[PDB]
Amino acid sequence: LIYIEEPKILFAHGQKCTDARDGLALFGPLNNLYGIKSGVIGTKQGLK
Amino acid sequence: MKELIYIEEPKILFAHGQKCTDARDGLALFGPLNNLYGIKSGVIGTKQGLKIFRDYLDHIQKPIYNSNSITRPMFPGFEAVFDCKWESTGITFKEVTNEDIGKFLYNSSTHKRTYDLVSLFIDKIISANKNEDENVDVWFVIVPDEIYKYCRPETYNYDAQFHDQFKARLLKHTIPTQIFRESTLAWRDFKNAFGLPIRDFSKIEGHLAWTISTAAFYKAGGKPWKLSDVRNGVCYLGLVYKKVEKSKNPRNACCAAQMFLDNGDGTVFKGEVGPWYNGQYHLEPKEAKALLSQSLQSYKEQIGEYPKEVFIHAKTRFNHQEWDAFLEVTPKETNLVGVTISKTKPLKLYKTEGDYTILRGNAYVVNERSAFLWTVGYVPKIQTALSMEVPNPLFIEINKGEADIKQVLKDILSLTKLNYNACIFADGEPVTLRFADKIGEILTASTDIKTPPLAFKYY
Amino acid sequence: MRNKIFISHATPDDNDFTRWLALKLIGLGYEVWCDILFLDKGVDFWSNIEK
Amino acid sequence: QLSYDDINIDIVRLNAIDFKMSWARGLKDILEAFEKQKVPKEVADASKSN
Amino acid sequence: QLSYDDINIDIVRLNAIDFKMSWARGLKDILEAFEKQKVPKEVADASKSN
DNA sequence: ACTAATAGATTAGAGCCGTC
RNA sequence: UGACGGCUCUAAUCUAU
């Protein structure tokens, strides 16, 4: 059993960490987008 | 001895309540109503179609002063005026090399080459739309002047100009593409043989950059401005009988009606097509029950009732055999005021003093069912007439039905500011006819799309 | 010397009018301080207004 | 919704500048009163302040 | 749960930076306040945080 | 029977411009 | 297609010999 090292995933400004949750929570996504337009449907109650 | 009755010019609302009259300056000091976080700029073109944007795209972020701001006003910039982020970010440069273009441009058969040139462009756009990761809000096809210099007048009946076929082929994809040109975007580096460029866009680089910015703004779901006098529950319909003399059979002459409603949601749509050509710009009674119903079905489900009044504008008068079918499809609760608008009547008045035209807003009424509205002419806002002589005041007649002509006159003077293609004081003919015409030029070129009531942005 | 134009206004709502007014007022060349835009962070909030 | 009997007592004795019915008299009378009161200002911006 | 009326005397007068409603705008206002006050700082580098 | 027939009456693309 | 004008070049259509 040779151990295979845990890989890496990049984040904002080309940085390199190992956790998707931790990196985004502290670094952010790679591409820079401004806002997100949320076309939302559903029932009247579901709006609440 | 006759007099010219006057009606006041209505104004247009803007950001957080404020309501100015001019779209030029009511947008700079206030900003668009609905703010959007940013616009992703997708651009496709040749080698020279990219460095031009790399000059222009960030050029309108900074303020640029024309020769005089009174007549050709400057704008502080895209961020300072339109309240949005629109810069060199999200660029989707998709190089179509000139040799690749030349290998399709070298074909001489314009009936086949012109379709081929668009086919080079759309296949990339829909591929990026579906089979790619990048997101583009408004696409900027920078076709060089050479492409539309030569390609100008089942999948080849489209016009010699590729304008119609390119946009008609995206109706399946519904991606808003802002067709551009090198001349309109590269005025500075374009020079003629004698040393004086033909297009003198320098002074217009104010309110021209207003057009480009506001055209790219509205297509992204934004609301640059809305009218502040459009009445409640009232529908303003307009059909222009656009020729379908694009295919081999000239038997088709299909109109493209459209509506501009109360809530600012002007849902421009598609009329009905049928064998009525004999050269008569009228539609048979059977198809009339499919146009106005689809017009009203798209609104009765939206609001829950019938419209109050349907201002059916047209450049062509309505015969009885056409209007009779309109009666049964529509409810009696709405008065279908068919305002046949004519710009060919020979009425031209001049002033004994002053080198300008008659002040706009004048409505020389002829009788209860006729009028003459100077929606185009001299104004007190920009103190410059939107014409060179006094035009034909838009002959306004209640062709069928009975109503107050005065209530009709103001609304045509209202359907002239919501030109989400330019930045002018107002238009000379109602947008209910110009936007009803751009559908016909685009849609009726191709006869294989069962399109939804797509707004002007896709066209 | 008294130079800043005091826009005495409600903090949450009238600032947006002032973000139209003051930003235009800066555009017109007028000197403007506000409890939102020119108010420095970490100051005595009551005492800074008195100054 | 500013009823004249509900406005602050210090306000009523002073001529209020109208922004409600239009912005036109709002910023204008703001500057028009400034012009008559010689309020200090710098330059005239670019393009003669448009 | 800490109301604005339960703030201790050492920072009652001091203009606090709001984070309750959203941490992002508080972080931004932190940035602008430091820039306005010319707070000494080096080039931005998140590798140090990493 | 319609065969033409020259006009009024309105139409719109559609080049040609300018694009005050 | 940045756009809203302006006429102009051609053609088409129905009211009637």
Side-chain angles (χ1 to χ4, degrees), chain A, chain B residues 1-242 244-459, chain C, chain D residues 1-44 46, chain E:
Chain A
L1 314 170
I2 88 164
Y3 166 93
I4 300 294
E5 59 273 30
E6 188 68 46
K8 271 338 181 203
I9 34 174
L10 261 44
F11 281 106
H13 39 278
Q15 273 308 123
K16 179 205 316 172
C17 92
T18 198
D19 210 321
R21 287 92 39 101
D22 282 291
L24 255 169
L26 164 59
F27 274 20
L30 171 136
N31 86 311
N32 52 314
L33 83 166
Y34 323 94
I36 281 160
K37 320 295 293 178
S38 72
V40 174
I41 72 161
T43 173
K44 174 62 74 188
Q45 160 32 266
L47 187 66
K48 196 47 47 193
Chain B
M1 202 203 149
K2 202 53 207 85
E3 53 146 31
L4 311 179
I5 309 97
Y6 185 90
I7 196 44
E8 57 272 2
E9 157 80 75
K11 56 158 159 294
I12 40 153
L13 192 141
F14 286 94
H16 53 306
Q18 292 309 345
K19 290 139 40 80
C20 170
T21 297
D22 195 4
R24 189 80 52 68
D25 290 2
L27 200 51
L29 323 173
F30 301 154
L33 201 165
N34 242 13
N35 77 100
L36 84 173
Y37 321 84
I39 303 161
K40 281 153 272 314
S41 161
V43 53
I44 164 175
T46 87
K47 153 182 261 193
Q48 256 312 92
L50 268 306
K51 85 160 294 305
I52 286 326
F53 254 48
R54 298 276 74 77
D55 156 51
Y56 170 89
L57 204 30
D58 316 323
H59 167 283
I60 81 166
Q61 319 284 323
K62 54 158 291 305
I64 180 69
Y65 186 17
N66 311 56
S67 82
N68 37 15
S69 164
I70 314 105
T71 75
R72 318 265 149 199
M74 25 55 75
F75 60 112
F78 199 103
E79 53 282 30
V81 166
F82 313 81
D83 175 38
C84 168
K85 211 36 158 281
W86 194 55
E87 73 285 358
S88 177
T89 286
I91 304 303
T92 321
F93 186 178
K94 272 145 66 77
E95 180 52 86
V96 287
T97 74
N98 259 319
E99 52 272 32
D100 194 358
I101 293 186
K103 95 180 191 308
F104 286 161
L105 188 274
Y106 278 0
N107 192 19
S108 300
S109 59
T110 183
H111 193 41
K112 320 299 277 281
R113 139 174 60 104
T114 312
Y115 168 79
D116 226 335
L117 264 192
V118 159
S119 321
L120 151 64
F121 281 65
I122 164 173
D123 292 2
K124 314 196 58 175
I125 299 311
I126 189 44
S127 83
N129 201 14
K130 309 180 321 303
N131 59 256
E132 216 170 86
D133 74 345
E134 264 203 54
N135 192 88
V136 163
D137 305 334
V138 292
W139 260 105
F140 304 133
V141 277
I142 322 297
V143 283
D145 283 87
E146 283 65 65
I147 296 308
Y148 91 115
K149 175 148 46 61
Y150 268 12
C151 301
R152 246 189 286 148
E154 84 292 343
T155 51
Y156 299 89
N157 42 69
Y158 327 128
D159 308 80
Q161 179 29 254
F162 44 111
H163 204 166
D164 45 83
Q165 32 196 15
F166 184 26
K167 295 286 263 155
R169 258 208 265 171
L170 326 170
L171 264 79
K172 176 69 198 57
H173 325 308
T174 80
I175 208 174
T177 312
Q178 260 302 286
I179 317 90
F180 279 19
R181 273 167 294 127
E182 186 254 321
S183 273
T184 59
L185 263 306
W187 80 258
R188 187 66 213 272
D189 81 318
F190 212 72
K191 176 73 91 203
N192 86 317
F194 300 136
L196 182 44
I198 288 117
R199 263 77 187 263
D200 191 359
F201 282 7
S202 186
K203 290 176 56 54
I204 318 85
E205 279 324 316
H207 39 57
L208 158 50
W210 277 92
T211 70
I212 312 142
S213 42
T214 206
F217 195 103
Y218 174 55
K219 274 159 79 65
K223 222 162 303 191
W225 61 67
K226 81 183 308 274
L227 261 287
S228 325
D229 78 281
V230 161
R231 332 203 299 261
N232 68 313
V234 77
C235 163
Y236 293 10
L237 202 139
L239 74 175
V240 170
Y241 286 86
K242 283 299 295 173
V244 202
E245 272 60 58
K246 260 61 78 186
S247 85
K248 187 156 42 202
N249 195 343
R251 83 160 193 156
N252 269 267
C254 172
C255 82
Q258 78 90 0
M259 83 174 28
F260 265 124
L261 259 172
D262 45 17
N263 280 16
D265 62 334
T267 66
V268 313
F269 57 53
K270 156 67 167 77
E272 324 297 316
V273 60
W276 35 62
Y277 185 110
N278 50 343
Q280 54 136 332
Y281 296 91
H282 316 296
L283 57 92
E284 271 147 1
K286 28 160 303 187
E287 283 93 348
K289 317 142 179 156
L291 182 142
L292 184 65
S293 67
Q294 156 198 316
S295 170
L296 203 166
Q297 291 314 312
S298 48
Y299 155 98
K300 63 197 279 294
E301 276 58 72
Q302 186 193 64
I303 322 289
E305 81 290 334
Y306 31 68
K308 305 303 150 293
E309 183 144 326
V310 191
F311 274 50
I312 303 154
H313 300 177
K315 324 199 220 137
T316 289
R317 75 109 203 179
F318 315 100
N319 64 57
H320 188 348
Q321 285 312 137
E322 182 159 76
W323 198 272
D324 52 13
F326 276 142
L327 307 197
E328 69 259 29
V329 51
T330 202
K332 82 210 151 299
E333 286 78 354
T334 179
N335 187 308
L336 270 43
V337 174
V339 181
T340 177
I341 280 191
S342 152
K343 71 203 181 203
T344 174
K345 318 300 301 310
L347 170 53
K348 286 155 183 53
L349 61 96
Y350 332 121
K351 338 186 300 317
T352 49
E353 59 265 42
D355 76 312
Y356 292 129
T357 78
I358 171 181
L359 160 74
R360 281 188 30 187
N362 283 281
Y364 159 52
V365 76
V366 153
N367 47 42
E368 181 267 308
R369 282 154 177 243
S370 187
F372 280 94
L373 186 50
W374 283 269
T375 303
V376 48
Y378 194 74
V379 307
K381 175 68 80 178
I382 85 163
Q383 72 204 310
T384 307
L386 300 160
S387 165
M388 166 306 306
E389 102 292 332
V390 151
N392 161 352
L394 303 148
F395 174 110
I396 281 190
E397 146 194 2
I398 308 189
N399 209 95
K400 270 68 187 186
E402 175 50 51
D404 163 50
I405 181 78
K406 274 212 151 293
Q407 98 180 346
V408 173
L409 263 282
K410 40 192 47 162
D411 315 332
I412 279 78
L413 203 53
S414 85
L415 304 169
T416 174
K417 314 268 224 210
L418 51 90
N419 183 21
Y420 313 103
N421 222 337
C423 196
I424 50 187
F425 185 42
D427 200 276
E429 59 251 9
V431 198
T432 324
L433 293 188
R434 290 192 335 282
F435 280 11
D437 156 74
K438 292 319 289 167
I439 300 158
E441 210 274 350
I442 292 315
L443 185 162
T444 71
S446 187
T447 77
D448 40 356
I449 309 97
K450 305 308 151 282
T451 171
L454 324 166
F456 156 74
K457 19 172 192 180
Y458 297 143
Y459 322 93
Chain C
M1 142 180 48
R2 294 165 158 273
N3 211 310
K4 52 141 282 309
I5 289 163
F6 200 98
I7 296 101
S8 195
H9 69 286
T11 319
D13 47 57
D14 289 355
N15 57 15
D16 190 279
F17 152 79
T18 324
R19 305 288 66 65
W20 168 57
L21 191 80
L23 264 302
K24 199 52 63 176
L25 280 175
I26 308 314
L28 317 155
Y30 285 103
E31 187 27 76
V32 153
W33 168 92
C34 262
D35 67 336
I36 283 312
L37 161 57
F38 271 70
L39 194 149
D40 213 318
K41 194 59 100 181
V43 311
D44 299 315
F45 74 121
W46 275 139
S47 306
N48 201 176
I49 314 169
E50 189 160 345
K51 190 251 172 160
Chain D
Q1 322 295 320
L2 278 174
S3 42
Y4 222 86
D5 47 348
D6 281 322
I7 324 190
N8 161 257
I9 41 186
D10 211 300
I11 296 183
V12 296
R13 77 213 197 177
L14 319 164
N15 45 311
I17 300 192
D18 38 354
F19 287 72
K20 331 200 291 170
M21 64 54 44
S22 61
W23 96 271
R25 314 305 91 209
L27 182 71
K28 216 148 186 182
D29 199 89
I30 274 283
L31 202 158
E32 288 325 291
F34 282 0
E35 179 61 72
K36 103 186 152 65
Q37 286 154 246
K38 296 311 272 217
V39 185
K41 91 166 185 175
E42 59 214 290
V43 307
Chain E
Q1 263 72 57
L2 183 76
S3 172
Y4 274 101
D5 309 319
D6 306 341
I7 170 167
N8 91 3
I9 198 167
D10 288 320
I11 53 159
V12 285
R13 295 189 81 78
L14 293 183
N15 191 208
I17 296 179
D18 193 28
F19 277 97
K20 306 178 187 194
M21 269 313 78
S22 60
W23 278 1
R25 86 185 71 197
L27 194 60
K28 289 177 180 64
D29 153 46
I30 287 193
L31 259 69
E32 322 312 322
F34 288 167
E35 294 151 36
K36 200 189 183 193
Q37 294 148 354
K38 286 176 185 141
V39 170
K41 73 176 263 284
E42 296 183 25
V43 73
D45 204 320
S47 314
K48 310 332 171 195
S49 50
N50 203 344

